[model samples]
Target: TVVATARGIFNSNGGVLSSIETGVSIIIPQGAIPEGVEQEIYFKVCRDNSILPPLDKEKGETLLSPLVAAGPHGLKFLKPVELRLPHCDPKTWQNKCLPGDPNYLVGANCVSVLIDHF
Candidate 1:
C-alpha cells in the first residue's frame, strides 16, 4: 500500500498541480478538463520512497528531472519525495493517527495507506 500526502491541488490554466514536498506532479494539457468541471488529481506513493528506480539510482543521488516540470514549463523534483513514516500502529496507524500514546513508535515493518477525496 502507498501513502500519498497532500490533497486537492489545482491547475488553473498555464499551471500544473503539484505536491511540492513529494516531488510529484500531474501533467494536464490545455483545456483537458471542461470549464467549471473542477477536475481532481492525486498521487500514490507507488513504492517505498527511500528506494530509487534504476534511472534515479544511476544519477548518484535523487536528482530532479525535466519530467517534474509542468507540461515542459514549471519544475519540481522528478521523483516522489521520500515518505516520512510516522511511528505508530502497523495496521490502524494509531487508528489513523488519532494523537495519543505519544511515547512509542513501531518499527519500519509497520505500514499504512491513505487516499484523498475531491
Candidate 2:
C-alpha cells in the first residue's frame, strides 16, 4: 500500500519535497528545471509485501529497502536532482555491497542518487 506521498510545483528556484512517514525526500537544486519550465512532481512510497526485490542467491545479494514510485515520467531537468532514501543498517554484510552503477552515494542509514529524470 501507499504509505506516503508528496507533490509540488517547482521552477528554476527549486525546492525540497519529502514524505515524513517514509523518510524519503527529493532535493531540487537551483536552476535544475530551467527558468521558464515549471514542473509538478509527485512521489509515492509503497510498502507492498507482495512485490519482492531482486535477489541473487549466488552472490548473496538481498533486498534492503521499501519500494518507491516517483514521477512525472520522461521529465528531464537541466541539472541533476537529489533523491534521499531510507535503508537498512549498514552493519549488515549485504548492505556493505554497493551497486556497480554511477551517480549514487551510500550512507549509514540512507542512499542518495543524482538523477535528471524519473
Candidate 3:
C-alpha cells in the first residue's frame, strides 16, 4: 500500500483499507451534447486538489496525500473503496487543527477534502 501526499490509500494486496475524499464534483463530457438520450456522454474534470493548506492540522490531525502514484511498474490511484476524505473548510476548522501524518504519508502530505454530492 502506498499512501502519499496525505490524501489517499493505495492497497495493491487486495486487502481492506480506508480513506477520505470529500467534494462536489461535476462531470463535463467532451464535445457537444449529443442530440438525444442515446448519446454517450464523456467527462473531463479538473479540481484544484488544493485546500486552505494545512498548517496546524498536521499537528492535530493525520492525513495522507494522493493515495497513489503512477510508477514505472504500472498505473495507480487510491482504491475508491479504501479512499476517504474527512475534509473541512479551514475557515471553520482553523481552530480544529489536523495532527500527525498517519499511514506513513511521506513527501508531500496535502490536505483532506469533504465533498458533498449536492
After superposing candidate 1 on the true structure, give the runs of residues whose Cα lies further than 4 Å from its correct spot: 1-4, 9-14, 49-118
lDDT of 2 by residue, 1-118 (tens): 3367676888888799888867878899997887877887766665764442323224332222466766554567788888888766545434446577332343646677777754
Tens-digit per-residue lDDT, 2-35, candidate 1 = 3333334333353354555544544454444444
| Candidate 2 residue pairs that clash | none
Root-mean-square deviation of candidate 2: 9.9
For residue 108, model 1's alpha carbon misses the true position, in angstroms, by 30
The full ranking of all candidates by TM-score, starting with the best, is 2, 1, 3
Superposed on all Cα atoms, the candidates' RMSDs to the truth, in angstroms, are: 12.3, 9.9, 16.6
Model 3: number of backbone collisions: 23
Please tell me which predicted candidate would have the highest TM-score against the true structure.
2
Answer with 2 or 3, whichever has the higher lDDT.
Answer: 2
Provide the lDDT at 39 for model 2.
Answer: 88
Residue 96 deviation, candidate 2, in Å?
9.9
Model 2, position 110, has a per-residue lDDT of 63
Put the candidates in lDDT order, highest first. 2, 1, 3
